[PDB]
Design a protein around this ligand. Structure first.
Ligand code: NI
Ligand code: NI
Ligand code: NI
Ligand code: NI
Ligand SMILES: [Zn+2]
Ligand SMILES: [Zn+2]
Ligand SMILES: [Zn+2]
Ligand SMILES: [Zn+2]
Lengths: 212, 212, 212, 212
């Protein structure tokens, strides 16, 4: 009677799910959110195929570190393992959001990385890499996503979408927003001419400044 | 006193008409929705030239399989026959939505098909074909649309819009959304460079996964 | 005490002004609306420099056929004469809307006409012409706009915006919407490839069908 | 007890901060607003890192002409000095807004100026210049921004955003809006073909007309 993920975590997931829709970052489909509770070693993750505005507290699924569901009746998101494997291999990330946004996904389908034409990319790294292609909801995808997100808080999923993660849902949410905005900027610039990419040294500095 | 299309069907059509506007899939003009009742063999279809937010339950038109109106005073949508002919030739489709969306229509006016640069296209097929041109509201259009939608749940109407159909209004609605999103993705990618199209074998697999 | 433009006309102008903003056709600046009362020979026109959401019934300006203001304290729109000269030279138009929209204005600044890549252009003509450049609010502008709108219900104002007119405000409003949508379609298509323009004969037919 | 910036100024800053978000000019991040009180020689400026919809009256920071904070507990915007240096070197500007908008920022990352393809640019000048690059929140930035905004009410910040200033917050706000709209127009036109730039003489005239 205190051993499983708490009410407010489930509540947080439902709130940020809505907010993805309310800010039209995404319509809702194929997107998913999770949190990891490091003391408990439990992931709570959004259910499969349920509209973000129809998700109840009882729809959130709780899972142990090896994918054994321990709470909830609903199937977990088809991408539960893309989330879980990040929590298994990395300790700097406690909240992840998957989304099919617009311009990030555009870069994803070109299989092009996002460079630092805009400095705000630093919330995730000097650039965002694009994972190698794999079918949604499969182990290859999750593995491809863990590898290409190494050293970053975001990665593009080829022909698919975006994955981002941070210390909490607020911060995970802002990283999607900010990475979608930078991808938007970068695509539009590239219609006009040659976007100017800030050098690595400046991006290094940027990382340091963002720490504070 | 139970022989004609039911209250809730008419209600469903009015709701999804609004939702096309409320999500700015379309402004309202030249768009139309219908359902087929297979036991009754009756199509209920939106009226002609009535703003989606001014359609009453009594404005919905009910029609038999040969286009004989059996309920309602209003003229049926000028595209009643583009809808009806799909219900006459196909049993996997019970709800259809026509819409003038943005990027699908852009592909429609280039007379370019939508390939599988994004996997979610699978809600409709491996690709969306573009019908041969014909004047709105005519028999050639309906015939051109039935033929080019063969084997799919969507087709582009040259210089015009989009047509999609599924087992119900919810699913028809999501197919427009999803096909508009994929067309958007595909156009934007093509501004940047060469969009990567997933191969037929993967799309085949995608079809199977979506069944579940 | 019945000789001047009526309450509901002034009300109609305020409503459609808002609706330009509420549908984000335009933000508000440099846009203006008028109606002509043909029995009275009076134009009511929106005031100068007043935010569409701050216009009162007493802000609407009433003017005779030679520009003599007969009702209202506010300066009339700086474009009062671009409106008035259409009512002086044409009897098929009783309501006009000026707007700085997005893609129509884009065509306006390229000084490129809108051809019939989308059939809905027929609410205005087979194409929309672009007027020759002149400084906002001047006689050359109004004259350039009257001439290039000949035979149409819309014209593009070089480096400026759009002008449209119809038998009433509802219809004038829909023509802006529809012409902005077609310009949007046409620009986007032209990013991808060669938009297919429907021939004059088909557009002729389209005109006839729209009459009904 | 009348020596510091007034309640309504702080209120004005909070209102226009929201309105940047409510009109989706910007999402909120890295944007900031200030006013200068010339009789008092005090700048009130938005706080650092606080969401525009969570800023209280007590969060607004008041500062003297040399950057000494005289009111408020919060850190001032990281760009306090980009604002302050404009008030130190120029008397025609009493309110400034910084923002990361879309198409202005796109021009900023290409390091391309905005010419007069649309006449409304005149609310800021004949063109908007792009400042030389410098790291957000630093003295080089502020200096680069003061210099490249000379003779204008707006400047683009390379790989960053936009800065604009006017006699008050209302007018500063409209200049961002209007400059973002013109940048949007200009980028889109440049996708299609060669945008037509109005000549300096016409822009000179435009300046004079806007005075009235
Ligand atoms: Ni417990
Ligand atoms: Ni019956
Ligand atoms: Ni009277
Ligand atoms: Ni005091
Ligand atoms: Zn997904
Ligand atoms: Zn249609
Ligand atoms: Zn204007
Ligand atoms: Zn900034």
């Amino acid at each position: 009677g205190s051993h499983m993920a708490s009410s407010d975590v489930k509540q947080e997931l439902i709130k940020y799910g809505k907010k993805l829709v309310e800010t039209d970052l995404t319509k809702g489909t194929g997107g998913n959110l999770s949190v990891f509770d490091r003391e408990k070693q439990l992931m709570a993750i959004t259910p499969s195929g349920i509209d973000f505005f129809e998700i109840k507290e009882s729809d959130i699924v709780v899972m142990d570190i090896n994918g054994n569901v321990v709470e909830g009746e609903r199937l977990p998101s088809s991408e539960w393992y893309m989330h879980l494997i990040q929590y298994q291999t990395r300790d700097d990330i406690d909240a992840i959001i998957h989304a099919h946004t617009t311009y990030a996904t555009v870069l994803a389908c070109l299989r092009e990385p996002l460079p630092a034409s805009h400095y705000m990319i630093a919330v995730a790294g000097k650039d965002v890499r694009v994972a190698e292609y794999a079918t949604y909801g499969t182990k290859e995808l999750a593995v491809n996503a863990a590898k290409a997100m190494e050293g970053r808080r975001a990665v593009l999923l080829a022909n698919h979408g975006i994955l981002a993660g941070a210390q909490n849902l607020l911060n995970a949410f802002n990283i999607v927003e900010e990475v979608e905005y930078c991808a938007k900027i970068y695509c539009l610039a590239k219609n006009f001419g040659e976007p100017v990419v800030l050098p690595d040294e400046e991006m290094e500095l940027m990382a340091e400044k963002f720490k504070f």
